Motif scaffolding. Sequence first.
Motif, mmCIF file in Angstrom:
data_model
loop_
_atom_site.group_PDB
_atom_site.id
_atom_site.type_symbol
_atom_site.label_atom_id
_atom_site.label_comp_id
_atom_site.label_asym_id
_atom_site.label_seq_id
_atom_site.Cartn_x
_atom_site.Cartn_y
_atom_site.Cartn_z
ATOM 1 N N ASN A 59 25.898 74.397 -47.998
ATOM 2 C CA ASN A 59 26.711 73.768 -46.746
ATOM 3 C C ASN A 59 25.797 72.566 -46.238
ATOM 4 O O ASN A 59 24.874 72.800 -45.678
ATOM 5 C CB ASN A 59 27.369 75.050 -46.001
ATOM 6 N N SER A 60 26.637 71.669 -45.916
ATOM 7 C CA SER A 60 26.276 70.354 -45.296
ATOM 8 C C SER A 60 26.159 70.553 -43.507
ATOM 9 O O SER A 60 25.709 69.748 -42.966
ATOM 10 C CB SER A 60 27.414 69.179 -45.600
ATOM 11 N N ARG A 61 26.866 71.705 -43.178
ATOM 12 C CA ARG A 61 26.864 71.951 -41.774
ATOM 13 C C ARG A 61 25.234 72.217 -41.258
ATOM 14 O O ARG A 61 24.926 71.622 -40.361
ATOM 15 C CB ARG A 61 27.662 73.321 -41.601
ATOM 16 N N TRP A 63 22.412 72.160 -44.113
ATOM 17 C CA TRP A 63 21.208 72.108 -45.141
ATOM 18 C C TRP A 63 21.042 70.910 -45.838
ATOM 19 O O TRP A 63 19.988 70.358 -46.225
ATOM 20 C CB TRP A 63 21.473 73.354 -46.264
ATOM 21 N N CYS A 64 22.079 69.968 -45.715
ATOM 22 C CA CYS A 64 21.955 68.713 -46.366
ATOM 23 C C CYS A 64 22.683 67.609 -45.758
ATOM 24 O O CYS A 64 23.569 67.932 -44.816
ATOM 25 C CB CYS A 64 22.232 68.833 -47.747
ATOM 26 N N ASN A 65 22.436 66.293 -46.036
ATOM 27 C CA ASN A 65 23.074 65.147 -45.399
ATOM 28 C C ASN A 65 24.129 64.694 -46.314
ATOM 29 O O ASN A 65 23.783 64.332 -47.503
ATOM 30 C CB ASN A 65 22.357 64.104 -45.004
ATOM 31 N N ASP A 66 25.545 64.774 -46.096
ATOM 32 C CA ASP A 66 26.626 64.010 -46.714
ATOM 33 C C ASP A 66 26.981 62.900 -45.976
ATOM 34 O O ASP A 66 28.005 62.145 -46.594
ATOM 35 C CB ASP A 66 27.526 64.878 -47.235
ATOM 36 N N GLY A 71 27.600 66.393 -36.131
ATOM 37 C CA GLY A 71 26.830 67.172 -35.269
ATOM 38 C C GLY A 71 25.991 67.952 -36.218
ATOM 39 O O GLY A 71 25.616 69.168 -35.736
ATOM 40 N N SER A 72 25.964 67.914 -37.468
ATOM 41 C CA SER A 72 25.424 68.855 -38.528
ATOM 42 C C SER A 72 23.851 68.764 -38.560
ATOM 43 O O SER A 72 23.442 67.535 -38.157
ATOM 44 C CB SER A 72 26.020 68.708 -39.937
ATOM 45 N N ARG A 73 23.012 69.398 -39.225
ATOM 46 C CA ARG A 73 21.622 69.266 -39.551
ATOM 47 C C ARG A 73 21.595 69.064 -41.121
ATOM 48 O O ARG A 73 22.651 69.216 -41.711
ATOM 49 C CB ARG A 73 21.381 70.639 -39.134
ATOM 50 N N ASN A 74 20.401 68.798 -41.377
ATOM 51 C CA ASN A 74 19.823 68.610 -42.630
ATOM 52 C C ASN A 74 18.395 69.325 -42.839
ATOM 53 O O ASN A 74 17.406 68.479 -42.888
ATOM 54 C CB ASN A 74 19.954 67.127 -43.001
ATOM 55 N N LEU A 75 18.527 70.563 -42.871
ATOM 56 C CA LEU A 75 17.142 71.537 -42.728
ATOM 57 C C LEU A 75 16.585 71.281 -44.070
ATOM 58 O O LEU A 75 15.230 71.572 -44.040
ATOM 59 C CB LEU A 75 17.696 72.782 -42.333
HETATM 60 NA NA NA Z 1 24.390 67.978 -42.782
#
Ligand code: NA
Length: 129
Positions: A59-61, A63-66, A71-75
């Motif tokens: 999920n992009s919420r 773990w990754c950048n889309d 407001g999401s993270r990119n862990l």
């Molecule tokens: Na993200």
Amino acid sequence: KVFGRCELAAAMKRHGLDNYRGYSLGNWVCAAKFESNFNTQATNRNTDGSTDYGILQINSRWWCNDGRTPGSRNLCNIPCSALLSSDITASVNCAKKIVSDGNGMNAWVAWRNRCKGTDVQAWIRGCRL
Ligand code: NA
Ligand SMILES: [Ar]
Ligand SMILES: [Ar]
Ligand SMILES: [Ar]
Ligand SMILES: [Ar]
Ligand SMILES: [Ar]
Ligand SMILES: [Ar]
Ligand SMILES: [Ar]
Ligand SMILES: [Ar]
Ligand SMILES: [Cl-]
Ligand SMILES: [Cl-]
Ligand SMILES: [Cl-]
Ligand SMILES: [Cl-]
Ligand SMILES: [Cl-]
Ligand SMILES: [Cl-]
Ligand SMILES: [Cl-]
Ligand SMILES: [Cl-]
Ligand SMILES: [Cl-]
Ligand SMILES: [Cl-]
Ligand SMILES: [Cl-]
Ligand SMILES: [Cl-]
């Protein structure tokens, strides 16, 4: 790429998923089956506007950048597109972070609902590993 069952089992084992955080290889193959039907190109939009990507529907919420989940993270420090490759390296490395975060494979809704507490060894039976 649409993996075969034993083909994916072999790729996951080579990248060190087998018994990672105490999850046997059949758990990972079962999760992939019900998350994506073994399709690295699988995408699914969530109600919140995040998207799940790749063979383990990461999920992009978090773990990754889309670029389209405000407001999401990119862990996993990756573009979500890295999770759609024929090569599963990026999905495996990010899955290792996810399954390490306290909640184990409960992070994958299809694993919890369709794999947990089942005969997951069935998913690697017959494979030459
Ligand atoms: Na993200
Ligand atoms: Ar394929
Ligand atoms: Ar794709
Ligand atoms: Ar990012
Ligand atoms: Ar990234
Ligand atoms: Ar990447
Ligand atoms: Ar990519
Ligand atoms: Ar994977
Ligand atoms: Ar998550
Ligand atoms: Cl295909
Ligand atoms: Cl196969
Ligand atoms: Cl199958
Ligand atoms: Cl292989
Ligand atoms: Cl052990
Ligand atoms: Cl297993
Ligand atoms: Cl899909
Ligand atoms: Cl974003
Ligand atoms: Cl982040
Ligand atoms: Cl990016
Ligand atoms: Cl691969
Ligand atoms: Cl656990």
